[PDB]
Structure 1
Amino acid sequence: MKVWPTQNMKRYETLSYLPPLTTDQLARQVDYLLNNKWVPCLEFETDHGFVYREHHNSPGYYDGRYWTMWKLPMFGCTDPAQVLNELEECKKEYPNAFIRIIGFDSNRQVQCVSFIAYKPAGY
């Protein structure tokens, strides 16, 4: 009978309970988002990697949901290599940030994909 750890067990939503994604698994997730014609976009955060409540406490309000946009959503992108390239660029400029890859469905206007692609040192 194993006891689930309580220390340094922060999670990052979708896919974070699986083993770390290898280079090929990451590429497959990007291909999935492109084959569904969703628009890829990168987001990064250096200060608050997890939600908190500083400015308000009402229902549905949380701080830390918005991260910073890396350049612009890659409209018209059809090559997964282009997305992977920006990831490397972002990592180089922000090695100390959490980097997230998202995919927009412009018809429903909902993000159909979202997962951490990079975590800084100590996470």
Structure 2
Amino acid sequence: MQVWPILNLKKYETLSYLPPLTTDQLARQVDYLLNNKWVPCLEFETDHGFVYREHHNSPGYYDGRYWTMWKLPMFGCTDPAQVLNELEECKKEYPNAFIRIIGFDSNREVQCISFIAYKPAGY
């Protein structure tokens, strides 16, 4: 009988309960997006990588949901390598930031995916 840990066990939604993705796994998730005609985009956050409530408390209001966009969504991107190269540029510039890959479905007209691609040391 194991007791689920309490300290430093913050999660980042989809796929965050699995062992961290290898470059191959990461590339396979990116291909899923491309094959579905979804637009990939990267987001990073250096301050609080988790949800909190500072500016308001009414139902459905939370701070920390929006992170900052790395460049622009990658319209027309056809190669998972392009995306992963960007993840590298981003990590190079923000080695202290959490980085996640998100995707937009222009037909459903909504953001449709979001998975942590990089966590800074000790997370």
Superposition TM-score tier, normalisation by shorter sequence: over 0.9
Q: State the Cα distance separating 1:113 from its structure 2 match.
A: 1.6
Q: How does 1:85-96 map to 2 (within 5 A)?
A: 85-96=85-96
Q: Equivalents in 2 of 1:10, 1:91: separation in Å? A: 20
SS of the residue aligned with 2:60? coil
Secondary structure of 1:2's partner? Answer: coil
Q: CA deviation at 1:112?
A: 2.1
Give 1:109 deviation, angstroms: 1.7
Q: How many angstroms apart in 2 are the aligned matches of 1:63 and 1:80?
A: 31
1:111 Cα deviation from its structure 2 partner: 2.1
Residue range with higher mean Cα deviation, 45-54 or 106-115: 106-115
Corresponding residue of 2:75: 75
Deviations 1:51-73 (A, max 9, x none): 11011000000000010000111
**TM-score, structure 2 normalization:** 0.97
RMSD over aligned Cα, in angstroms? 0.7
Taking the aligned partners of 2:66 and 2:112, their CA distance within structure 1 comes to: 16
Which deviations, in whole Å up to 9, do the C-alpha atoms of 1:22-61 show, x marking residues without a partner? Answer: 1111110001111000000000000111111011000000
| Number of aligned residues | 123
Unpaired runs of at least 5, structure 1: none
**Sequence identity, in percent?**
94
For 2:113 and 2:65, locate their aligned partners in 1 and report how far apart those are by CA, in whole Å.
Answer: 15
Q: 5+ unaligned residues in a row in structure 2: which ranges?
A: none
SS of 1:85's equivalent in the other structure is helix
2:118 maps to what in 1? 118
Distance (Å, rounded) in 2 between the aligned partners of 1:97 and 1:41: 16
